[PDB]
């Protein structure tokens, strides 16, 4: 026999004694070690004392699991552990003061999201995401990336869209204080004003330019081509997206941006960030230039409180 700790959150640990002739699956249920599925594996001697993740099998663990992850999905733990099994093997080099990811397993979109998250103000609601976020900012991002995959219901190797990943992540973050007031001007119908809250207040699809959004954009009306423009914005940042197209990025006019090259779904992302000059982060690779023209699909801008001056 050996003694071990079981857990669902790696915080509340539960002391357990195992029989060395019985696989973990028969004694605990699905059991994992550092992401590795050890369900159908018998206890070893090097396994003495180590802490194992277990799928919740009593009410105490179910409550602990929800409090840490904010999900009751019985598949979440296994998807998380399956991702972690790869992400713990990726490299996370510091590039220009930011934790990036060396290229592997189609992770370019994850590197771009990871880099963006280090440059905008965000509070995640699940303790598991917040804790991993902090550790990620300090260079240890394997767990954060695994969690991103599990929360986005994506698997290692799958082809990911950065805008969609950020949107999923935003939905697990505290964006309640975020507010966007819009005004639509139709010649026949008139003037209608809507207010958005949460994730919808910080994201727009249609143009990369925050200025253009403030000046107004052409959207078809219910009557059938009105104009929508930003009336008031209340958020620490905004994300502007558009299908990839050549675009000029000017130093000091944006926080950071997603560059996307190639075919729909199987292309490659790079990350552009505005520091004292423009830096391009391609996984572990870093280039700099005073101007930038290229195929851009997301642009992030800082914000606090904006009210329009249109009467
Ligand atoms: C890399 C990648 C992975 C997965 C997906 N999926 C998209 C759809 C289908 C499955 C799942 C994930 N989503 C539900 C997309 C891309 C991808 O390539 N995203 C780039 C940024 C992109 C976006 C758009 C676009 C977005 N919205 N509209 C109206 C348009 N248009 C593009 C046109 C050409 C090239 C790139 C484009
Ligand atoms: Cl929740
Ligand atoms: Cl791997
Ligand atoms: Cl890649
Ligand atoms: Cl949540
Ligand atoms: Zn407990
Ligand atoms: Zn929650
Ligand atoms: Zn892998
Ligand atoms: Zn969710
Ligand atoms: Zn109308
Ligand atoms: Zn109308
Ligand atoms: Zn400049
Ligand atoms: Zn890639």
Swiss-Prot record:
<feature type="binding site">
    <location>
        <position position="221"/>
    </location>
    <ligand>
        <name>Zn(2+) 6</name>
    </ligand>
</feature>
<feature type="binding site">
    <location>
        <position position="189"/>
    </location>
    <ligand>
        <name>Zn(2+) 6</name>
    </ligand>
</feature>
<feature type="binding site">
    <location>
        <position position="223"/>
    </location>
    <ligand>
        <name>Zn(2+) 6</name>
    </ligand>
</feature>
<feature type="active site" description="For PL-PRO activity">
    <location>
        <position position="282"/>
    </location>
</feature>
<feature type="domain" description="Ubiquitin-like 2">
    <location>
        <begin position="1"/>
        <end position="54"/>
    </location>
</feature>
<feature type="active site" description="For PL-PRO activity">
    <location>
        <position position="268"/>
    </location>
</feature>
<feature type="active site" description="For PL-PRO activity">
    <location>
        <position position="108"/>
    </location>
</feature>
<feature type="zinc finger region" description="C4-type">
    <location>
        <begin position="186"/>
        <end position="223"/>
    </location>
</feature>
<comment type="function">
    <text>Responsible for the cleavages located at the N-terminus of the replicase polyprotein. Participates together with nsp4 in the assembly of virally-induced cytoplasmic double-membrane vesicles necessary for viral replication. Antagonizes innate immune induction of type I interferon by blocking the phosphorylation, dimerization and subsequent nuclear translocation of host IRF3. Also prevents host NF-kappa-B signaling. In addition, PL-PRO possesses a deubiquitinating/deISGylating activity and processes both 'Lys-48'- and 'Lys-63'-linked polyubiquitin chains from cellular substrates.</text>
</comment>
<feature type="domain" description="Peptidase C16">
    <location>
        <begin position="68"/>
        <end position="311"/>
    </location>
</feature>
<protein>
    <recommendedName>
        <fullName>Papain-like protease nsp3</fullName>
    </recommendedName>
</protein>
<feature type="binding site">
    <location>
        <position position="186"/>
    </location>
    <ligand>
        <name>Zn(2+) 6</name>
    </ligand>
</feature>
<feature type="repeat" description="LRR 3">
    <location>
        <begin position="114"/>
        <end position="136"/>
    </location>
</feature>
<comment type="subunit">
    <text>May form homohexamers. Interacts with N protein.</text>
</comment>
């Amino acid at each position: 026999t050996i003694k071990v700790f079981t857990t669902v959150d790696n915080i509340n640990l539960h002391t357990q004694v195992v029989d060395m002739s019985m696989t973990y699956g028969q004694q605990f249920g699905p059991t994992y070690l550092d992401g590795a599925d050890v369900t159908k594996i018998k206890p070893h001697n090097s396994h003495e004392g180590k802490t194992f993740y277990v799928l919740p099998n009593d009410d105490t663990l179910r409550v602990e699991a929800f409090e840490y992850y904010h999900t009751t999905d019985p598949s979440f733990l296994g998807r998380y552990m399956s991702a972690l099994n790869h992400t713990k093997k990726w490299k996370y080099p510091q590039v220009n003061g930011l934790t990036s990811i060396k290229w592997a397993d189609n992770n370019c979109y994850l590197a771009t999201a990871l880099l963006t998250l280090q440059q905008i103000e965000l509070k995640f609601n699940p303790p598991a995401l917040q804790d991993a976020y902090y550790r990620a900012r300090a260079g240890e991002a394997a767990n954060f990336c695994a969690l991103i995959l599990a929360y986005c219901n994506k698997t290692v190797g799958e082809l990911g869209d950065v805008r969609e990943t950020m949107s999923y992540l935003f939905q697990h973050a505290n964006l309640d204080s975020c507010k966007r007031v819009l005004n639509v001007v139709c010649k026949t119908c008139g003037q209608q004003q809507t207010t958005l809250k949460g994730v919808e207040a910080v994201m727009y699809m249609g143009t990369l330019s925050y200025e253009q959004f403030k000046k107004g954009v052409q959207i078809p009306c219910t009557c059938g081509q009105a104009t929508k423009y930003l009336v008031q914005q209340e958020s620490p940042f905004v994300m502007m997206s558009a299908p990839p197209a050549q675009y000029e990025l000017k130093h000091g006019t944006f926080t950071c941006a997603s560059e996307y090259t190639g075919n729909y779904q199987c292309g490659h992302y790079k990350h552009i960030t505005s520091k004292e000059t423009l830096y391009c982060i391609d996984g572990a690779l870093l280039t700099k230039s005073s101007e930038y023209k290229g195929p851009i699909t997301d642009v992030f801008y800082k914000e606090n409180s904006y009210t329009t001056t249109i009467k």
